[model samples]
Target: SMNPPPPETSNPNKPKRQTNQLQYLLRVVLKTLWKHQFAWPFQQPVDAVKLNLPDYYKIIKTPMDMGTIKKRLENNYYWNAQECIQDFNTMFTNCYIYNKPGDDIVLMAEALEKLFLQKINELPTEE
Candidate 1:
């Protein structure tokens, strides 16, 4: 009889397992945000030239968006969930700062933020 290899989950690397689980959870949250109808404006970086907002880049020091966040997560640039969520907050904050109050884009960002918080909060807290 031949012996089979041990399963990955059966390994003693608990920390690695935890990180993978967190990644899965964050990916799920991100996927939901990307699917939202209001996610269009935030899907990619703002086109200053196309939008005719030359001041957009200057006003917002940090440019964040759904695609950027997704790539960062996939690239393992985020060490934890908090950092992942922080980017989302930054994206929304930038929208609020750049767009006028009550503007359509601003309103969309507001609704997306609400949905993000609701979904992220549903995840179980890790030790």
Candidate 2:
């Protein structure tokens, strides 16, 4: 009879696979920025700061953002940004694997800026 192999041991240190909205947003935003390929000189870092990392980070941890896009839509805008989905239309319409961060990135940056602006436009002022 063959000897049985030793039982496998669990490794607690294994790197956790991040599977949440914040993780999803980080990837989408970063890839969108990196693929931007707009003006190489300052585009990259500018996109990162545009998030006001220190501020929005606290609120948008999840897309649809807990009603972020819900009251506005049936589901979250994040549903559109999910990795398995179409990778976000703007991302595909604007970028590719080897893109070098140029005009495409700039366009993406502008889109992001305008999106935020639109969000504010929908805000209640005197209610």
Candidate 3:
């Protein structure tokens, strides 16, 4: 019997298969960086250590205080301390959704800054 035809080599002219493997690998790295790198500003501060609300407020009014009862309350008021921490975690976790290739960090920062400024302008400031 005739020898079987040599196995055909891959056609050099064929279009390459589209694979997301590279994108996936890059995404994993980006997610890890995002989880660690961009996480500091969003962390909740330590809990208030004061005994009473008046003392807490008084402590907050003083300058150079390490822990602020007001800041703690502002940080943890809407949600309990645990919930606030969880929310902060969620915020950073959600950042991964935008970690795809070609993400423009500068544009994102500018957009957020503009939105925050707009909101501040809308706030009722004491005259």
Best by TM-score: 1
Report the Cα lDDT for residue 111, model 3.
39
Model 3: lDDT of residue 108: 43
How many clashing pairs does model 3 include?
A: 0
Model 1 Cα lDDT, one tens digit per residue, 1-57: 222231121223333223743575456778888888888888877777777777777
TM-score of 1: 0.78
Clashes of each: 0, 6, 0
Ranking by lDDT: 1, 2, 3
Question: Deviation in angstroms for 71 in model 3?
Answer: 7.3
Output the better candidate (1/2) by lDDT: 1
User: Residue 44's C-alpha lDDT in candidate 3?
Assistant: 28
TM-score of each model, in listed order: 0.78, 0.23, 0.22
Cα lDDT, model 3, residue 14: 38
Question: Residues 1-127, candidate 3, lDDT per residue (tens digit)?
Answer: 1222321223445333322322321233223323444333323221234322233223322221112222323332222233223332333333333334335533443333344344334433222
Ranking by TM-score: 1, 2, 3
